[PDB]
Ligand binder design. Sequence first.
Ligand code: LYS
Ligand code: LYS
Ligand code: LYS
Ligand code: LYS
Lengths: 295, 295, 296, 295
Amino acid sequence: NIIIGAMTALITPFKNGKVDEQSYARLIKRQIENGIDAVVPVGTTGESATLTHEEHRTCIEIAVETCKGTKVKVLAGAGSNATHEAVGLAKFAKEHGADGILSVAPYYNKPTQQGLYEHYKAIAQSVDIPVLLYNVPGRTGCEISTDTIIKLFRDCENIYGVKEASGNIDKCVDLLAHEPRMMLISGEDAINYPILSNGGKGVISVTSNLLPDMISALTHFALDENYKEAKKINDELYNINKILFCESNPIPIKTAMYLAGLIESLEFRLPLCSPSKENFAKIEEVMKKYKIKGF
Amino acid sequence: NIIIGAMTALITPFKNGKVDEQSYARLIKRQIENGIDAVVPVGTTGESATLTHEEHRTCIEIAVETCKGTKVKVLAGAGSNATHEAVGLAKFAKEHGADGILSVAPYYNKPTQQGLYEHYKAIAQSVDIPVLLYNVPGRTGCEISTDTIIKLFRDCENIYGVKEASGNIDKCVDLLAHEPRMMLISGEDAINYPILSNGGKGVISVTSNLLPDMISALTHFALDENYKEAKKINDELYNINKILFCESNPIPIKTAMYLAGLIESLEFRLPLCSPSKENFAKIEEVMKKYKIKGF
Amino acid sequence: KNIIIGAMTALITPFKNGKVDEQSYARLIKRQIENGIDAVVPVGTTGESATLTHEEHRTCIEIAVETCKGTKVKVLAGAGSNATHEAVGLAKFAKEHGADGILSVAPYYNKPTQQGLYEHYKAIAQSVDIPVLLYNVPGRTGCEISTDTIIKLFRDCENIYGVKEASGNIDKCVDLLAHEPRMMLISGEDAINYPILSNGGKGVISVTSNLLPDMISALTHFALDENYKEAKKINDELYNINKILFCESNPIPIKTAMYLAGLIESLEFRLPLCSPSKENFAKIEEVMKKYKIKGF
Amino acid sequence: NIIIGAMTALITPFKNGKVDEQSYARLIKRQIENGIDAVVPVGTTGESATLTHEEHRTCIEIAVETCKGTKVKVLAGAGSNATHEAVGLAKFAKEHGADGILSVAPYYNKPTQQGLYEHYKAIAQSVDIPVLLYNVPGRTGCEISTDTIIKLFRDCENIYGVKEASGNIDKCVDLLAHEPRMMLISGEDAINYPILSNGGKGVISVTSNLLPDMISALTHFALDENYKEAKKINDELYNINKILFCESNPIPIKTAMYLAGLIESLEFRLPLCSPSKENFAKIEEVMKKYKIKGF
Ligand SMILES: N[C@@H](CCCC[NH3+])C(=O)O
Ligand SMILES: N[C@@H](CCCC[NH3+])C(=O)O
Ligand SMILES: N[C@@H](CCCC[NH3+])C(=O)O
Ligand SMILES: N[C@@H](CCCC[NH3+])C(=O)O
């Protein structure tokens, strides 16, 4: 059981410091109507760090409910650097109708490979829905090694692949060569096409928040082996794909969504904050080059 | 007001998955009686990541109370990657008698330097006790730049320095060359001496959990500029210091405390776990060279 | 621009008793020619450019040029140096001795600024009228030719026609061709031949092709023909050898493989290069068993 | 047999593209008259890369000749990424009266530890003068492991230590902890003091080209255990120490020597070239803070 294809790491819109739940539902519906295959509530892009556990839960529920009666899957953000917390989130997602969970490598405490293994095993054994690993060492301070990922995929029935955001093409090659059953998911927008053309089966995208049609089309073109068309969109997207990381994600994507009139308010929770006026200008300029779907 | 000198990042003993509160109190007593100037409850070494906010709060209470009627100060771990969580921990520490707080840079969500400034300013403005910044980019995925550290030190009266755990002596020179009024504290036992010998004013040690008398002496000898004697102790500590990081802290230190009979069970919270058998054996071997004080 | 693209081999330089084995070298090149290779690269990194003297370097270029004469196979001569006066000297030699083009690695060790890189390659490009392919390998040189610098050189210098990327940076490969799709992007790492080719790259300068020229050539031409199913088939078959051929710094594993296959007489390097560990030696030997290795 | 103390990695002046041999001798005399213990002709700082073998040998001879009768030693730059070239240079230097050689780790071709061991062994066995290893992975793309350095020091009588330029204080601790008989030499001006206060026995300096009296003083104050003074100079020197690397060495140091009127023209050999105007401005600005000795 797997979750693949074009997916969106949903931004979490705030209004006066709280999640704007109507806005959230509306943004999710906008994803659905633009051909997206799955949404990821409360990943990194959704400011998982600054949402309380109960708000985190509410967002997951809104995604499930908004996606009900549609083919769009909900891959709920359920990671934590504490296994008991990650287990709690995983169980909740399962109990509340999520289709799978995305579970980021523990940040800050730098577990050993053995610890990572037990972390994810405890999580995968706690629910019967697909678990996607999520490697992003630049943020977590640790890496799930290729051996650990493969071992987890083989030992745990529900662990089905990994979202890679380690900027390491070679590891991606290794993963699929040793374990071609696993689903490699691009966590790096700029190289969506190369990852897909090289055996990856989906993306969890930041850019698709703004340009869901473009990211969905890219992903589907590639899965269909229409590489020319997929490369073409990837090339077109390169500028925005890079600019959306001029400051730590999701600062730029939220800024663009606001500039586009897709969210009412440009609000973060500290320590995240508005970009510098210079990057605000930079984001505004790149944005003009693209056609941005409305509601 | 400041909190400097020899300081111990207290490990957090678990018994059957719960904080062993009597053991915790006993360990702190032991530190007090071995010349330590301050104890740091629930820092990284205390597994801040896997304690609930309640357990976290309980550990701060145990420390404050245990140190009552002594010279020994409590520098409460109060960091978080969410500013609202960090403010609550700071306020709690203040309201419950902690002498100051240690506040680690936001991990995982990678805030901008502007975000780090606002994060720490909000924390500093919420309490009137001393605030020590804490820089450990290997763990957080971000660095508080020297400029940001200095601006915060200057702009906020209660922010009085930084614990550096970045293994970057160039930066330590940079901080004190440009702003020698701040209290630079070593957050890595391996370079306590380099930092102390460059005008650092203390340590927040891991090694001092096992050898509080050695770390204390080392620190006071250096503070007295008796570098002959300081380096003498530091050279003696080389082996233990090195082995206490063969796996991510606090895996080795807890393993050592257990071998030394100072804690009842070798228990961690996932994703942390016991060291490899090989490292367990190495740690045990290294400890033989040292005189480990009991209670 | 005139170009040199397609399937290319970064020729090993065989030594016997510490000296260049010129007969073996020529024989190895003829084998490449007979296996569908589009061009050969004498005295690149894989050919131990660093430890050949200037006169040996030049002999190897001459042997490659003369051996390829009367065939379709082009010679893209190694002519890089971290000293511009040496690089220009090698470039002029290559040009005057009939090489079809040159490959010129970014200056290593002295870490020039981007302006310096631009001046370095501009001087090289002005000194000859043959194609120049830039060569970026920051892991080795301690410097990177920025995407901006590459594109500027490509556009400003008539004969600079592309770059061999050996950086394991697919993002950079997208950057290059997204902004300047006229340039020839050439893979300089076998492990990412396919990623680069499938992104519009126009060739490879291969280590693996020393041992398996027929496979690398077919892989490249399938991909160039947009026959991605067949190209992928081959690339997948190649995984094991590609991986093991970098268990130690290239060309330590490739020469070991060439020796084990009886294609070179002695397993000899010039220091500081040396034999792989016995364990890696054994691993290489095992991995080769799975492959059909063409003889002479 | 060892070469330690305050040493200078000499710049090589050009005039109309040729080595300015008179200027070179003059600069060497200036070092000698300012308390320097040894000079290093044709290291990285002396643009080893772009000198011919014949020019490289000429510079070595000039250094030996100018130092003759003085007690100042010549630690000749004899490094190469080709063992036969490094041997050639080593032999030339021994035969022409150099006191020892500095031999950088092979750059570009990334030899294995075994290869590095054999490289250095061949060099050490080619001559009977002291050989100092030189680790600068940022420039070479390889590292001489701690283990390899210790083996070489132990196995070869004339290999007496290493100049470290890897900004890794921890390795410096490891090296002296396992092998306290070796001479650790600072190849990183900004942290000369920390290295010396932690067991180092000398510096091979870029800054000393410009401020030989201050580098000499700092080194000797430290070797005589006057850490207060040594640190003082180190702190003062921080700005020039840092600005001297705003662009790749020796671009900034040559710019500064020219600004000080110590060389006739700001000339490099490509691919090195003049710094940017902005950086020129920065260097000129920082220099005003210092009293620069003339001839
Ligand atoms: N800020 C903490 C708790 C978040 C819990 C709810 N998502 C963390 O990032 O792990
Ligand atoms: N695991 C979360 C929650 C910590 C709760 C307070 N100790 C974090 O590390 O931020
Ligand atoms: N070993 C030197 C000289 C090479 C001579 C020509 N191959 C270098 O790597 O640049
Ligand atoms: N440029 C070559 C040759 C140097 C010749 C001796 N100084 C190198 O850096 O190795």
